[PDB]
Amino acid sequence: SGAIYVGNYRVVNRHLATHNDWANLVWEDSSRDLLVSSTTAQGCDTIARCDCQTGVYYCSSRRKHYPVSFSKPSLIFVEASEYYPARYQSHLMLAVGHSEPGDCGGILRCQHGVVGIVSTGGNGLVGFADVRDLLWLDE
Ligand SMILES: Cn1cc(CC(=O)N2C[C@@H](C(N)=O)C[C@H]3C[C@H]32)cn1
Ligand SMILES: [Zn+2]
């Protein structure tokens, strides 16, 4: 679990979105595993605007933060789950690191701010849904 709070928006993994998230829906994209809902309170997370390939993510299944090198956002094949059929997930970045399904929602940050959230995992690879291209999150 986990979310990004920026301005009047809440960014979560689409597969973990609540009834409240869907009732205040702003935007969602199944191909990216993202959902953004509106909030009443103000968010102060800074979204990174960059091409960094190094950062730190939070891993709840280890209660630890790990530094990682990660790939450029791209279309990557992802296995079927109770949430999606087998498909290409877009805007996904991979890194060598530990993750388990409940780790979804952990933030990846670089020196510029929030880069994305944990979304996929398996075989010692962790995948993060990028949010740096969503320029409207700031305005
Ligand atoms: C962080 N993490 C996720 C997994 C499994 C995994 O790859 N998943 C894929 C995800 C998706 N974006 O399609 C849906 C849920 C089932 C999860 C393992 N560690
Ligand atoms: Zn950066």
From Swiss-Prot:
Zn(2+) 1 binds at residues 50, 52, 110, 112. The active site is at residues 15, 33, 104. It comes from the Viruses. Coiled coil: none annotated. It catalyses: Selective cleavage of Tyr-|-Gly bond in the picornavirus polyprotein. Cysteine protease that cleaves viral polyprotein and specific host proteins. It is responsible for the autocatalytic cleavage between the P1 and P2 regions, which is the first cleavage occurring in the polyprotein. Also cleaves the host translation initiation factor EIF4G1, in order to shut down the capped cellular mRNA translation. Inhibits the host nucleus-cytoplasm protein and RNA trafficking by cleaving host members of the nuclear pores. Counteracts stress granule formation probably by antagonizing its assembly or promoting its dissassembly. Homodimer. This is Protease 2A. It comes from Coxsackievirus A16 (strain G-10). The chain holds residues 869 to 1007 of 2193 of the full protein.
